[PDB]
Amino acid sequence: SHMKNSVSVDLPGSMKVLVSKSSNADGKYDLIATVDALELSGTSDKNNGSGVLEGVKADASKVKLTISDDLGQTTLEVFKSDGSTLVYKYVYSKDKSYTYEYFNEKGEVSYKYIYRADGTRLEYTGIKSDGSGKAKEVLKGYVLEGTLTAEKTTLVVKEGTVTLSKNISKSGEVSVELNDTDSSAATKKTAAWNSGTSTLTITVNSKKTKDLVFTSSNTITVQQYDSNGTSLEGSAVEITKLDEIKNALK
Numbered sequence: 001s002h003m004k005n006s007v008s009v010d011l012p013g014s015m016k017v018l019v020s021k022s023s024n025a026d027g028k029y030d031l032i033a034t035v036d037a038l039e040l041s042g043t044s045d046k047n048n049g050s051g052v053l054e055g056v057k058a059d060a061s062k063v064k065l066t067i068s069d070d071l072g073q074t075t076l077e078v079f080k081s082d083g084s085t086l087v088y089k090y091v092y093s094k095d096k097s098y099t100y101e102y103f104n105e106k107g108e109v110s111y112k113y114i115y116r117a118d119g120t121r122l123e124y125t126g127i128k129s130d131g132s133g134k135a136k137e138v139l140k141g142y143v144l145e146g147t148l149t150a151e152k153t154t155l156v157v158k159e160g161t162v163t164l165s166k167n168i169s170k171s172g173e174v175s176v177e178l179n180d181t182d183s184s185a186a187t188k189k190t191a192a193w194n195s196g197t198s199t200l201t202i203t204v205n206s207k208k209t210k211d212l213v214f215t216s217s218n219t220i221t222v223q224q225y226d227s228n229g230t231s232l233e234g235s236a237v238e239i240t241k242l243d244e245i246k247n248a249l250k
Contacts, residue, residue, distance in 0.1 A: 001034045009049035011067060012074045013092035017049045033065065035076060040065050061087065080107075093117075120218045124148050139218060141240040157242070159249040162189055166214070174214055176200050178249075189249065202248075211236075212248060222248050 006018045017033045024030075031042045031053050040063065044051030053065045060081040067074055072094045078087045085107035090100045095117045102111040112124040120139055127133035133148040137155055144166065146155035153168040161181045168174055178191040178200065191202050200212045207229035213221045213236065222244075223236040239245055 001032045001039055003030065003032050006030075006032075009071075011049065011071065012094050013090075013098070015074060015092075017053075017067065019044075019047065019049050023047070035063070035065060038063060116218070118218060122153070142242045144242075157245050157249070159246040162249045164245070164249060174198065176212075176214060178202070210248065220245065 001018060003018045003020065005021050007021055009017050009019060011017060015033065015035065017031055020030045028043045028045065029047055029051075031044055031049070031051055033040050033053055038055050038057060040053035040055040042051055042053040046069070049071060050067045050069045053067075055063045057063060057078075062079045062081065062083050064077045064079070065074065066077075073091065075089070075091050077089050079085060080087060086101075086103045088100070088102050090098065092098050096115075097117045098115045100113045101109050104110045106129075108129055110127050112122075112127065114122040116122075120137070123136045123138065125134045125136075127148070131148070131150045135146045135148045135153050135155065137144040144155040144157070146153065146166075152170065155166040155168075157164045157166075163179050165177050166174065167176070175195065176193055178189065180189045182188040185205060187204065189202055189204055191200050193200055198214045198216075200214075202209050202212070208225045209229070210222060210224050211232065213223075215221065220239040221236040222239060223232050223234065225231065226233050239248075
């Protein structure tokens with residue numbers, strides 16, 4: 001793309017926009033960019049690169065790029081020729097976090113990919129009209145699997161008669177629970193969640209055995225209690241594979 005008497009500005013998602021050095025008789029600035037092979041254009045009351053740019057594809061699809069007033073976010077929408085039914089949509093921030101969505105012929109979401117600033121990911125596949133679907137969380141060393149519903153995301157790990165469930169609410173709040181179908185007092189596992197420290201403490205035969213901590217870095221650590229069940233010993237150790245979570249549930 002080209003523009004007489006202009007300045008190039010770098011944006012989130014490794015995008016670029018050209019903006020005029022000075023305003024026209026109506027006090028406005030001209031904008032131009034090329035995105036995924038198509039030229040978009042617009043005008044703005046501001047001089048920094050922010051505003052709305054639009055274009056139209058060969059197949060009649062309508063494309064719209066919105067650059068936030070402080071340059072911290074970009075949104076790219078592709079609609080049907082009606083200008084309202086979404087085909088796909090993606091959003092980048094200056095910290096490198098990013099979300100991509102695809103839609104069915106009715107304009108309802110069917111797939112969603114989320115990349116967090118720390119490099120971990122959430123992936124939702126086969127999303128239905130009722131809001132349900134398959135869910136996967138991709139961490140450093142291993143992947144967790146489960147389901148999406150209208151209320152929340154639930155990731156599940158099973159070992160023998162024990163089931164561990166990691167819940168994530170609409171707003172990203174994490175809580176964890178454990179249930180064991182074993183009847184014997186000698187071997188049945190139970191647990192207590194502390195929301196104030198993001199920690200699950202496991203008990204067997206009335207005594208504390210270990211602490212599993214669910215950290216702000218999206219990792220899990222394990223640490224054992226002494227043989228009396230009184231104090232933690234050694235140092236906490238970071239989990240690196242799924243089999244090590246299963247080991248902790250034995």
